[PDB]
């Protein structure tokens, strides 16, 4: 009743790796960080990109997280930010080999 990972496109697999890892960086739980990095490693397994790309992507993530995205309310909007980082101009050249 959930879709297999393999039924996503390669671009989507890479985007989801980025989104997941990003969620790992903003989590405070040890529990949630572990869940996040195991989740990301599934996506990595399904991808056809070399490991270097993923390393670079982590760098980009670390940089784009220091961006402030705000709204009409208190909040940090980090979860949104992760979704945006995953689909960012900076991340896009890493979806190719």
């Amino acid at each position: 009743t959930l879709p297999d990972i393999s039924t996503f496109s390669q671009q989507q697999i890479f985007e989801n790796w980025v989104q997941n890892r990003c969620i790992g960086k903003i989590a405070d739980s040890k529990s949630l960080k572990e869940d996040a990095d195991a989740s990301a490693a599934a996506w990595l397994e399904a991808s056809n990109l070399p490991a270097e790309n993923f390393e670079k992507a982590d760098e980009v993530i670390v940089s784009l997280l220091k961006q402030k995205v705000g709204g009409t309310e208190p909040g940090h909007y980090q979860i949104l930010k992760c979704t945006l980082i995953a689909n960012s101009d900076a991340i896009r050249p890493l979806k190719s080999s």
Binding site: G70, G71, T72, E73
Partner: protein
């Protein structure tokens, strides 16, 4: 257009946190607020003003709406609320780029401030009494904008 004094007093009744505004309006508005689906009360407050001063939002507006316990309709999207003001009152009285308070000195009414920087809203809709706002205005030089930078301000004067 609703009279200003009434608009202003009505606005005071919903000038609280979203959670509160939900408790107050109840119905499907309160259901969505309780659910955490609605987080921005700006268009809901403006809906409340309109409804409580004899200019209630028509059931068949081409804008996304939802009912309260009073069985009146409340628009939950700032984008819709904004378009609604032009759809319903027509041309505004004032349109100013880089909007400052000085641009609206000596005029009362409904103020819309559009700009960039907020991810969940293209702008703010509130009341303006000639020097101060119902809650925050978010005009240029205002200290509580944060990431928000106002690009244009538009005023529909209220009698």
């Amino acid at each position: 257009r609703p009279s200003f004094n009434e608009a202003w007093l009505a606005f005071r009744k919903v000038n609280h946190s979203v959670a509160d505004v939900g408790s107050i309006i109840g119905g499907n508005v309160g259901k969505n607020i309780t659910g955490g689906y609605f987080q921005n009360a700006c268009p809901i407050r403006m809906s409340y003003v309109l409804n409580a001063t004899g200019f209630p939002i028509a059931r068949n507006s081409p804008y996304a709406k939802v009912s309260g316990a009073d069985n009146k309709f409340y628009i939950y999207r700032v984008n819709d609320m904004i378009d609604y003001l032009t759809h319903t009152m027509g041309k505004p009285d004032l349109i100013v780029n880089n909007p400052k308070q000085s641009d609206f000195i000596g005029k009362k009414g409904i103020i819309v401030v559009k700009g960039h920087g907020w991810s969940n809203a293209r702008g703010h809709v509130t009341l303006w009494n000639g020097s101060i706002c119902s809650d925050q205005c978010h005009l240029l030089n205002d200290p509580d904008n944060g990431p928000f930078v106002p690009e244009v301000g538009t005023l529909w004067i209220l009698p």
